[PDB]
Amino acid sequence: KPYSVVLLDAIEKAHPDVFNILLQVLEDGRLTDSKGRTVDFRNTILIMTSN
């Protein structure tokens, strides 16, 4: 589903190495992982929460 709201809970609990992974989504809208597949975050709505 490259068509879904991705809700990434917390960002305090997202140490900067994870944040690089989120960052690739936030810029690129892609991650290359799993088997080397590029995951289309084109129409996702990435929502990273904080309190």
CB of 30 to a copy of itself, least distance (A): 9
Q: 1 to 51, contacts with a copy of itself by CB under 8 A? A: 15, 17, 20, 23, 27, 29, 32, 42
9 neighbors 49 (Cβ within 8 angstroms): yes
Token pair of 23 as six digits? 């960052």
CB of 21 to a copy of itself, least distance (A): 9
**8 pairs with which residues across the strands?**
48
Chain residues binding a copy of itself by CB under 8 A are 15, 17, 20, 23, 27, 29, 32, 42
